[PDB]
């Protein structure tokens, strides 16, 4: 087996994207936890781990076709300081990823490579779920009031580690 | 073994400081608990116990060098009535302690007494953690709003004992 | 409720006394343990803990009447080198305390404040028991012989942590 | 608290180095596992996890001093095809790291910041252990014979997930 | 890795000292146990085992720097007949060891080798504890009375 | 009772020999373990512990006769680099010990001291078994091939405590 060049290019793009996402999510997890906001920290940690698993699967697949994984690149990382900005950054990233996934699935399945298409389909479902949750939380913050919102996710524990 | 005079002087200063801190923390624990604020009471109580253990370790050490522990002194104790004032008092105390610890560690380790230096290093780490937590809580109170902050740490139980 | 000034004065004096006692007992516990006499260390440590509990109860009561606890003042602390001197110091302290307790209970119960009177009565019973035990041990030391007495409370641990 | 600029610079450099190491180790884990050499895969995977933990600790510390972690930069990643080349790459990386650690510990502890010095000391111990193991395995491969060496770490699983 | 010569010299001296201490402590354990004083035999055995562990750690460290451990040389061993003499011998040994440890830690940490300095720091803490206990027991023997002291550690079994 | 002088001399010599053996075996255990060879390390550690127990028994006996144990003297310690040299050193030591044990047992039992003779007999049995195992392993190394031999006792831990 030898996957064509274009399939490998798409797989590499998606791999780099998932890596960037891992980095962003972990940085945000630490930043949030340090300030007192706890449950947000727990949620964001879980999401980072999920993106890790994604990266693993893509790496294996791109190995099995006689490819050269690219663990040397990275797209721009964004960082915020309030809550609204964090959520907006994450929403932007997920949108871009979804568009790429769709285009890639089309081109792939038009060339008789089915397994890669299935991998992309799974990734796509998950990214859609995630963007949905982000949008919901953003709408709440808009409605209640930033102080009100924050006042529900603070507990008494040790900030630093 | 006979630790030099200056080492003993520094150990005695630190001992007196830890004693003062114990007293302040327990008074604040009672005052907070009596008004309804519960979780604050639990936290402050635990912190007082920790400072107790600190004092014990310092006493044992200063005994092992043929010294004369000083259980007769006390630095000025501060007391507030609101929350912000309590937190600010505690922050002031911790700052003073940290500065003393650093100067003492330097002078000690410049005279071939290593064990005392290690004791001071441990104490220093812990005091740093504590000051960090204090600053975080103070920032929250500044942001949310005093009443809207308190409204998260009140339960239905027996005030007095 | 607002307890009169005189009731609060008596409560404050008793509080300061129990604090001084806590300090003295703990210092003696360390000093005894460091020399090898363990079985005395255990007893004295337990007694210190009991006096701690005393202080806590008194503080709560003096809070419930709209008072101002006084955690800033200490009486004189005594320290002895041999054993007989330790026991004699403790006996002196307990005697002073008992006299104060009796006078206070009388004046209180002559003014329609019954709960404080009950608190004092409990404290009085306990401090009397303690003075009794002290006197007994002192009589033994007088009879047997100092060295022949010590020879019964030494074990093979000889610590100083 | 506000750590000086130079302390933060050293912490940031060490953080970037640990990140690069994580990436290299995991790529090597996958590459080895895919070819049949199992036990080497297990070992290298565990080492990657350890470096992950290192990175986390450094990030927290650099946060506590009011710093700006740098999750956006990577050094050069090396990849080899045979086994000897893998081991040699890892050895090179560890050497660079050790030199940096020593210089940094000196400069730090010459400026009254002790906790960062302790962090570096722990990291240094661990990196030394690791370089030792690498050198040992390389010497064996040199002695036995490459094929006769590999023949000891192959099992009947031959997966690639 | 290539540890300098002077670091290795200090490590070797400390190793030889710990070995001598092991030998002395075990001989004393047997001698005491044989006469009836059991409760002292137990303590002394435990201390010998601790010194064994010390020796092991030092040997490994001096191996990791490309060194040549020296398991061929011993210092002088002392032996006493009564009890006070045993305690005094042990006290002397520990004092000497402590002085060496301090000087070595200084010179080491002045040359960027940190892990060895940490090893020495741990050893130093432990030796200090031990010398303390020795001094305490000696003071008791001085106070109570030799026979009246012994009479508390004999056992019919 | 008081054992004669010559009995005590023989007991002291044997004690010194067992001490030297303890030292050699532990040094070899560390050296082997540090290079990767594991199972050899485990075996050699066990052997060192056995020699320790030997020394303990001998010292107790020499005390019970009103003697003066000699914890101050050591014979020469040998050290190698490869495997063959290690095994050959150990074989040499055991041979010497055997000869001494036999001569001593004879002289002892010719003087009405039976318990010491029994002690020596036990020690002798054990030393014989040990020398046997050494010779067997040496013959294997001769037959298979040094590298092809080592390739069977290496695992993926490669430690060196500190
Ligand atoms: C900056 C910090 C971290 C980075 C850059 C990072 C990155 C990675 C990468 C690149 C992988 C391999 C991708 C793959 O196998 O497909 C991975 C796997 C993994 N990492 Fe990390 N990681 C970080 C922190 C952590 C931490 C602190 C933990 C603590 C447990 C952790 C746990 C894991 C796990 C469990 C996996 C494998 C998940 C699975 O097998 O399903 N990661 N991570
Ligand atoms: C100079 C003043 C004091 C000193 C030196 C002191 C010392 C100590 C020490 C060393 C302990 C050790 C407990 C442990 O190791 O677990 C202790 C326990 C304790 N302290 Fe104090 N203390 C002081 C005053 C107080 C005060 C003012 C209070 C009450 C507000 C208090 C309440 C307690 C209690 C209740 C315990 C035991 C907790 C339990 O048994 O659950 N102490 N103290
Ligand atoms: C370099 C390391 C060691 C050395 C030099 C050493 C040396 C010795 C010596 C000289 C004796 C008894 C000597 C006599 O009876 O006069 C002995 C006995 C003993 N030591 Fe060690 N030892 C070492 C390691 C250890 C370790 C690590 C342990 C425990 C984990 C240990 C436990 C014992 C035991 C159990 C005995 C008695 C053996 C038996 O009853 O058969 N030794 N050792
Ligand atoms: Fe993803
Ligand atoms: Fe403290
Ligand atoms: Fe009392
Ligand atoms: Fe690392
Ligand atoms: Fe030692
Ligand atoms: Fe033997």
Curated annotation (Swiss-Prot), chain F:
It comes from the Bacteria. The keyword S-adenosyl-L-methionine does not apply. GO terms for molecular function: ferric iron binding; ferroxidase activity; heme binding; iron ion binding. Residues 1-145 form the Ferritin-like diiron domain. Heme b binds at residue 52. Its cofactor is heme b. Its EC number is 1.16.3.1. Keywords: Heme, Iron, Iron storage, Metal-binding, Oxidoreductase. One of its GO terms (biological process) is iron ion transport. Binds 1 heme b (iron(II)-protoporphyrin IX) group per dimer. Fe cation 2 binds at residues 51, 94, 127, 130. Signal peptide: none annotated. One of its GO terms (cellular component) is cytosol. It catalyses: 4 Fe(2+) + O2 + 4 H(+) = 4 Fe(3+) + 2 H2O; Fe(2+)(in) = Fe(2+)(out). Pfam families: Ferritin. Fe cation 1 binds at residues 18, 51, 54, 127. Homooligomer of 24 subunits, arranged as 12 dimers, that are packed together to form an approximately spherical molecule with a central cavity, in which large amounts of iron can be deposited. Belongs to the bacterioferritin family. Iron-storage protein, whose ferroxidase center binds Fe(2+), oxidizes it using dioxygen to Fe(3+), and participates in the subsequent Fe(3+) oxide mineral core formation within the central cavity of the BFR protein shell. This is Bacterioferritin. It comes from Streptomyces coelicolor (strain ATCC BAA-471 / A3(2) / M145).
């Amino acid at each position: 087996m030898q996957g064509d060049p274009e399939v490998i290019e798409f797989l590499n793009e998606q791999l780099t994207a998932e890596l960037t996402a891992i980095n962003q999510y972990f940085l945000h997890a630490k930043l949030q936890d340090h300030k007192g906001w706890t449950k947000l920290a727990k949620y964001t940690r879980a999401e980072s781990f999920d993106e890790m698993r994604h990266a693993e699967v893509l790496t294996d697949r791109i190995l099995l076709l006689d490819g050269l994984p690219n663990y040397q690149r990275l797209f721009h990382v964004r960082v915020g300081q309030s809550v609204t900005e964090m959520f907006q950054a994450d929403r932007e990233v997920e949108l871009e990823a979804i568009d790429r996934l769709r285009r890639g699935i089309e081109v792939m399945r038009a060339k008789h490579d089915i397994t890669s298409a299935n991998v992309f389909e799974a990734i796509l479902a998950d990214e859609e779920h995630h963007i949905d949750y982000l949008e919901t939380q953003l709408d709440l913050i808009e409605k209640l009031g930033e102080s009100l919102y924050l006042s529900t996710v603070i507990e008494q524990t040790q900030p630093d580690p």
